[PDB]
Amino acid sequence: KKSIYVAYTGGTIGMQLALMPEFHRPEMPDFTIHEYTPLMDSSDMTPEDWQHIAEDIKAHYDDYDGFVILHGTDTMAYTASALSFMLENLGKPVIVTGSQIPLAELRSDGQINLLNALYVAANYPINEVTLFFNNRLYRGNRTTKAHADGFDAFASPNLPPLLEAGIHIRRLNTPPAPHGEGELIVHPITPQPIGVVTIYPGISADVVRNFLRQPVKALILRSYGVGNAPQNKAFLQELQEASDRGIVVVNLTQCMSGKVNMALAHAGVIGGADMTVEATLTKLHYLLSQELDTETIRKAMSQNLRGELTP
Amino acid sequence: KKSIYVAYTGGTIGMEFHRPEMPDFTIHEYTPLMDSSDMTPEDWQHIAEDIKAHYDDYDGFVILHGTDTMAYTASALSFMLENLGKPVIVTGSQIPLAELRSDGQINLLNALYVAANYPINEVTLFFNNRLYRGNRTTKAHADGFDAFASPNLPPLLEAGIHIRRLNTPPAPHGEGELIVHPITPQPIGVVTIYPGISADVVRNFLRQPVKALILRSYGVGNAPQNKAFLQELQEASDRGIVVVNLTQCMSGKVNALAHAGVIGGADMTVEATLTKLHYLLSQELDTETIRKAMSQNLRGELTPD
Amino acid sequence: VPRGSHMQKKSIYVAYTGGTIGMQHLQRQLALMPEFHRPEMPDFTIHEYTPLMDSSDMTPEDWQHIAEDIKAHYDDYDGFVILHGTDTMAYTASALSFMLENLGKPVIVTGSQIPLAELRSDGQINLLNALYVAANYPINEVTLFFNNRLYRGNRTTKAHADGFDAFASPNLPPLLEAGIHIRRLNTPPAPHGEGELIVHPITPQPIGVVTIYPGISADVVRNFLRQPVKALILRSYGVGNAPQNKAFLQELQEASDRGIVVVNLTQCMSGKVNALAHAGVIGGADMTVEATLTKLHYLLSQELDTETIRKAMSQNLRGELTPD
Amino acid sequence: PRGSHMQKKSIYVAYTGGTIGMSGHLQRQLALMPEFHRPEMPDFTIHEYTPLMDSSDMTPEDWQHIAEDIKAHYDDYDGFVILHGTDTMAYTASALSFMLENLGKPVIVTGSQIPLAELRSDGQINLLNALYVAANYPINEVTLFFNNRLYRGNRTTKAHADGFDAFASPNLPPLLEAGIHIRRLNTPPAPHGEGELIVHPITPQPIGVVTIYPGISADVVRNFLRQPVKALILRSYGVGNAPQNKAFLQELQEASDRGIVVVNLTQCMSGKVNMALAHAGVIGGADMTVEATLTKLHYLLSQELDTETIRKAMSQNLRGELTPD
Ligand SMILES: NC(=O)C[C@H](N)C(=O)O
Ligand SMILES: NC(=O)C[C@H](N)C(=O)O
Ligand SMILES: NC(=O)C[C@H](N)C(=O)O
Ligand SMILES: NC(=O)C[C@H](N)C(=O)O
Ligand SMILES: [Cl-]
Ligand SMILES: [Cl-]
Ligand SMILES: [Cl-]
Ligand SMILES: [Cl-]
Ligand SMILES: [Cl-]
Ligand SMILES: [Cl-]
Ligand SMILES: [Cl-]
Ligand SMILES: [Cl-]
Ligand SMILES: [Cl-]
Ligand SMILES: [Cl-]
């Protein structure tokens, strides 16, 4: 019989398991729930909350066959993405899930997403940080909350799911992530000021100038299509002035799906390929927190570290 | 036999047509031709005034446009055109008409044919066999022929062996003389909510007099409750800045921030919200009238409660 | 979809006909699940059929049995949930739409891909949603609830044998979608009568279902004509195309001349049927096989001449087809 | 595979008929369309069939005609596009996959929902893409190209009679998707032999296609047992269920007794049969389409094999048409 650790970090799902007979069925793994203190709305999470969860998995790693992280949907994809970088040589499944309706409210999805995450962690283990939602397991660092009001809340726009649940559970033929074998390594992080700039008609040089001020180590650009911005010379020079001061400037697509393929490149900007804002932001927290020079971080942002981008 | 006007504004498309089932059409090549990534809000104005000049002498309008900001233009034209009595269809291509496997020919042919034969008196975006309400569109798929989505509204029309109008609820629609609303430059900020965002971002925009702030918030419109954040946002509204709360999510409806003077943008796209703000800021309306108008369905861009 | 008052506590009748949901006791499982008993949920009464059936073993007589059950309890409840096996859920939902006229209360067919007894069951959530919908969104048609969508019954088929999304409505959007909120879609209404519920009964009808496939001969239509048939459904290619060889077209004209109702459908999941006409074949527009088979059982069970049935097959009686 | 672009390829186009051409009209239309003659496009040769056929009128003999045409021209060209009516495109693609052993060159079936000669035709783009894919992405399978996707032929059905997205592959992802770039998908390969192309004959075989539906009688299986059956395809419910009626199960057991190959499929668009009918001699068709199962039976019944060998072969993945357990 497998044993699954459940980190109950907060979220809708919690806003009871004993009174439901399905959970204690013989076919289920054993599981234990740790209720965090305090419980958090995932809208209130900081990057240090990613650290608390990573260290909680680290404490429990040896004594469980897998890990379920119960979490608010608002930032679930950021947490999943962060854990993927912070965990290295992961040898057990870590599945983040939650609910769009609280377990306490009628028609809650919370019971069914938790039961599925527990069953899948035990019986179809995949040694990656994954996100289970509405009968699909996704690579955590490929996810976004796409549908604010839907039970199918999460998408994986640039990658098929890893696993689908119907009458049976099927592992899909999705290409595996680069995967280290060895001792689990858990990478701590420390606060990093990062700006997120959306490219839109009538954006000014002033925005890039503002972030440069004193307080930012990296800039994420949400640019058009395959990575275009207006060719405004003030804008470009601001971006060059950013990279000249060692700021890591990364070009993403504002589009739900697709790949940046770039100039901005002349202005020191690094392409983020098909990375989500969630993967890019967390990967920056990860790399900035390490003993790495600006140029090594700039190189690593465009490489596939944990399956978050297509080379 | 219908006559369709084609504004060739630029874009990928330019970097069977004359056979008898087709409408007559005329192409106006803009000077200069523009990559849509280079568009400013004054380019929306130039297109609206071009449609105004040609309105009386054509049965419909096709706007040829780069894909990068097609949804922004479509969205802007929907506000700027009032009491529209003929179809305005924005389209283009993911591959240049000049490159192999181009979608340009089939998107243009379709847009001309639909403008002539299935007119809908709205600013629409035709792409990959679907017609969408312009102010509901986003470029969702950077690399795909199905480049555009309408996440919170079904398409108005779909083309197969036959073309059918779908049963999509009609937009609020004025009858009367076409009114074309000019716009003038408006400084507007777009803030994405994410873990570890600082009050300084809102402090920065408050100090470089922006007239409006769009928040891309979590889920149904949540942000972290950090008192410094909420305070800077309140300071912005105190100074008369229009702060509108949208979902960063592809689909759904926004539902403390309110206490801080922030307005709910319901299920509006960033494209709709930004262009609506250009439109309303450009008219001579109180901040309070602008704040109430942002949450009202002016042209079919949002789903009322 | 009407948004019905929640003011008073509703009473829903549950016809537990059989199906996966109750296999391994249903009533005891539901007694033990607190969500079913909350103040926001309607009161409900379960009639367990004797015997319980695997929906694979259902005959038209079972359609008749369920319609009589609804008629018997119609004045006494606010709505009806038919718990049913998935395998023929779409044929039952299609048959009820034709057999019930002047329907002034919801009838919702639902079930599960996995038994309530088994692990990872969809039965709890499909039945909870059906009950809640029947109470609060009382659409006066026979509908099918599965996987957070309410569908027009006579537009459904089981499209996904292994999926929790088992049912599709290929030629009509859903009536309603469930998320954080329950959203009514603006799908236009079916024809509606007025007054007390009328059940149009059925009696056995021999009906053949021919698939058109390359190498099918005129001896197939001759074989169906050979003893047991009053109607032939053709699952034709694309928009209603069949071999145009004279033997095949003669065989069909001979069938129609003997008063066999021949109906041309697409074998395709979606689309609309647009020679065969001159051979007496009637176009079934965008109808499913489930809608067409059940419509024929309804129409053939009435004292109608062949011409009247032919005409009625191409007409939208209950929302099952899209008129030109 | 992403094939080399170094030498100008030569693609043979079998113009069998279909919506695309509705003599000399196709070939003249393509002459007049500059897209087709650019440097980046392969050279191509059109063989226009006489007569051209509506795909609705196709029989197994037509599958054989097309297979002989490919074999006759195999060494002379780098690849084959089969231009075909949509109505039975999926039956032809499925039949070729079984008939063509040691296939070392792409064969791509395509066509159009709207004639090249009409307005808003999809024929231009489906055929241009097919040619360009055959030359540059030379997958050694019978494939079907429609609406920017390349599918495994023996996994397809015409799902959408009115849509430009007419074809689906309900149980297998596409092999390739076309956008700004051409993306190859992770889809695992079919079994492949080695050496010269071998064409297995497919002949006429009396095969019945039974839809299971409430009220179906034993008389249907008795009817088919009259003559037109060496094989019977059951379109059963869900994961392969049928009524438990003793007479029904008797007639099926009787058929398998008389050497009739009885194969159980789902009537559902997607999913997999899971097998009683097994005790009645019925063979499970796993997740095969009717198109793959009809053509597989034509193939095996026309081969030098006994009833037992055909029954075993029907549940085996021969060409990528079936997902093994
Ligand atoms: N999660 C995401 O990154 C989706 C999209 N690329 C965006 O810019 O929001
Ligand atoms: N077009 C859009 O607005 C999509 C999504 N709401 C975003 O914030 O990018
Ligand atoms: N339910 C259906 O009718 C689907 C499809 N038209 C078929 O012939 O099976
Ligand atoms: N192509 C197919 O076989 C689809 C579906 N299984 C049918 O029975 O028609
Ligand atoms: Cl949503
Ligand atoms: Cl690793
Ligand atoms: Cl102007
Ligand atoms: Cl894309
Ligand atoms: Cl208006
Ligand atoms: Cl109630
Ligand atoms: Cl070539
Ligand atoms: Cl269709
Ligand atoms: Cl050899
Ligand atoms: Cl399935």
Numbering used by the authors:
A (entry chain C): 3 to 17, 34 to 280, 288 to 336
B (entry chain A): 3 to 17, 40 to 279, 288 to 337
C (entry chain D): -5 to 18, 30 to 279, 288 to 337
D (entry chain B): -4 to 17, 28 to 280, 288 to 337
Sentences reproduced from the published study:
L-asparaginases catalyze the hydrolysis of L-Asn to L-Asp. The genome of E. coli encodes three L-asparaginases, called type I, II, and isoaspartyl aminopeptidase/L-asparaginase, respectively. The active site pockets of these enzymes are shaped by two protomers, one of which forms most of the active site scaffold, including all catalytic residues; it will be referred to as a “major” protomer, with the second protomer called “minor”. Yet, as we demonstrated here based on the reinterpreted structures of EcAI and the new structures of EcAII, under some conditions a citrate ion can be accommodated into the active site cavity and even displace the canonical substrate or product.
The structure of the native EcAI was refined by Yun et al. with Refmac5 and a new version of the same program was used for the current re-refinement. Whereas the original model was missing part of the N-terminal hairpins consisting of residues 14–39 (with Thr14 modeled only in molecule A), we found that even the starting maps had some indications of rather weak density for a number of missing residues, indicating high flexibility. Although we modeled Thr14 with a covalently bound citrate anion in all four protomers, the corresponding mFo-DFc map for this residue and its ligand is completely featureless (indicating a very good fit) only for protomers A and B, each belonging to a different dimer of EcAI. The electron density was less contiguous in the case of protomers C and D, suggesting that Thr14 is more flexible in one protomer in each of the two dimers than in the other one. The structures of both the native enzyme and the T162A mutant are very similar near the mutation site, with the only consistent difference being the presence of a water molecule located between Thr14 OG1 and Gln272 O in the native enzyme, but not in the mutant. In crystals of EcAI (wt or T162A), C5-atom of citrate is covalently bound to Thr14(OG1), forming an acyl-enzyme moiety. Under the crystallization conditions (pH ~4) both the β1 and β2 carboxyl groups of citrate are predominantly protonated. The binding mode of such a citrate anion to the active site of EcAI mimics very closely the binding of a canonical substrate.
